[PDB]
Amino acid sequence: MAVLLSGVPVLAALDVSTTQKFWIEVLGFTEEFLTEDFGGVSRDGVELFICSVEDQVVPDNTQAWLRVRDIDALHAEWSARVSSDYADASHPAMTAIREVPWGREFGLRDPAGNLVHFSELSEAAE
Amino acid sequence: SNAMAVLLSGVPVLAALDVSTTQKFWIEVLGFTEEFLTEDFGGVSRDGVELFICSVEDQVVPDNTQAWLRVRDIDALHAEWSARVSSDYADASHPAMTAIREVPWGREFGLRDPAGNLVHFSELSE
Ligand SMILES: [Cl-]
Ligand SMILES: [Cl-]
Ligand SMILES: [Cu+2]
Ligand SMILES: [Cu+2]
C-alpha cells in the first residue's frame, strides 16, 4: 500500500555552505551532507534541505513550517543566539511568539533570507 | 534536567502564481486531502503528511522551489499517478512525472506540478 511518511522542506540560498553553517552552529541542527549546491541538516530526526539558487528573490519568497513541542523553550534556547530585531534584514532574526488560530508560533529568518515558521499546534489542531 | 524543545515534523511550502489551481491539482490529480484554502495560502495532506502552497508574483520562485516527500511503496505510488500525470518530463507545458530512478539513498521520482514546483518522492533503502 502506497503511504506518504514525512516531508522535507527545501530552503533556498545563494550560499548553501554559509546558510548551512548557521543552521548547525547557531540553531543546533546536525549536518547530514554538504555539496556546493545542496546541503542537508536535521534535528530530533526532522530533516531540512538547502539548495543553491542564482536569484535572491527566491529565498526572499521561500518559507517552511516546522512543528515543535515546547515552543517557549525553543524561543528561549535561541533568544541569546538570534537577534529579535526582525525589521533589520541585514542579519538573521526571530520574532516574538504569537497566537495563531491553530496554536502558537514564531518566525525565524535565516541568513539566506528564508522564513521558517516554528509552530506549536493546539491539541484541538492536532 | 530542564525543559528542552523537540522538533516534531516539517511542512514544505510550495510556491505558485495561482494557489487555487495548484491546490486543485494536488487534491484532484494527486489525491491529497484539503486542509484549507485562501487566496494566498492553501494546505493539503495525505497520510498525515502536510504540504502548503503560498502565492508569489514571480515565476522564477516556483521554478526554483523543491520539496522531498518520503514514501513507502514507491512503485505503487508511481502506478497510481501514471494514470493522471504525463511521463513526458521534458515538455514543460504540462505537469509531469519522471520514471523511478536509483539514487545513493534509495529510489525516487520527480514530479513537476502546474505551478512549476519540483517535488521528489523518495523511498529510502535499508
Ligand atoms: Cl510572511
Ligand atoms: Cl532539479
Ligand atoms: Cu513576507
Ligand atoms: Cu532543475
Side-chain angles (χ1 to χ4, degrees):
Chain A
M1 181 195 290
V3 175
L4 306 190
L5 299 177
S6 59
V8 183
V10 181
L11 306 183
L14 268 54
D15 186 343
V16 174
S17 178
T18 306
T19 305
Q20 183 145 315
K21 179 187 177 71
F22 169 88
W23 281 87
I24 294 168
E25 297 181 5
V26 178
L27 296 190
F29 281 64
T30 305
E31 183 164 74
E32 290 194 332
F33 55 83
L34 183 59
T35 68
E36 163 74 25
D37 290 310
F38 202 114
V41 297
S42 81
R43 171 169 168 165
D44 308 315
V46 175
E47 254 180 325
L48 279 176
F49 293 159
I50 308 171
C51 290
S52 67
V53 300
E54 308 226 53
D55 304 305
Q56 182 59 37
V57 64
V58 176
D60 290 357
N61 281 88
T62 296
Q63 294 177 105
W65 261 257
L66 297 179
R67 307 302 189 193
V68 305
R69 155 145 33 88
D70 201 342
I71 194 179
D72 301 271
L74 185 61
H75 192 274
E77 172 187 339
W78 290 343
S79 64
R81 318 177 62 81
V82 179
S83 175
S84 72
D85 193 358
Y86 194 88
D88 187 347
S90 72
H91 53 57
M94 172 175 73
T95 72
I97 297 162
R98 70 184 186 97
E99 283 188 51
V100 292
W102 57 91
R104 296 168 68 224
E105 61 179 52
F106 66 86
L108 184 144
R109 184 187 63 236
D110 73 6
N114 306 279
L115 171 53
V116 174
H117 305 255
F118 289 85
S119 174
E120 188 167 21
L121 298 182
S122 61
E123 282 203 5
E126 65 258 22
Chain B
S1 64
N2 275 337
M4 177 179 190
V6 178
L7 301 201
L8 298 176
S9 60
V11 185
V13 183
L14 308 181
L17 267 57
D18 184 340
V19 174
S20 66
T21 291
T22 305
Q23 178 147 315
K24 176 172 180 276
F25 172 85
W26 281 87
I27 293 168
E28 299 191 3
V29 178
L30 297 191
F32 282 59
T33 298
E34 191 164 25
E35 290 196 339
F36 56 85
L37 183 60
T38 65
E39 176 64 23
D40 289 317
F41 207 120
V44 296
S45 62
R46 176 168 173 161
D47 306 312
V49 174
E50 267 185 309
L51 197 58
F52 294 163
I53 306 167
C54 184
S55 62
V56 297
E57 310 196 348
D58 197 325
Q59 182 66 36
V60 73
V61 181
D63 286 358
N64 279 277
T65 297
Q66 301 177 94
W68 261 256
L69 296 187
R70 306 297 192 194
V71 307
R72 163 152 39 78
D73 205 343
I74 189 168
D75 299 291
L77 185 66
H78 192 273
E80 172 184 339
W81 290 344
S82 70
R84 300 192 295 269
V85 185
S86 175
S87 63
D88 190 10
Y89 195 82
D91 181 357
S93 64
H94 304 285
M97 174 175 70
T98 73
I100 298 171
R101 64 167 191 155
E102 290 285 345
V103 293
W105 52 93
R107 293 169 74 219
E108 73 171 41
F109 66 84
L111 187 145
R112 180 192 59 243
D113 77 6
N117 303 282
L118 168 59
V119 179
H120 307 254
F121 295 84
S122 157
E123 180 159 32
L124 303 174
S125 63
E126 292 334 314

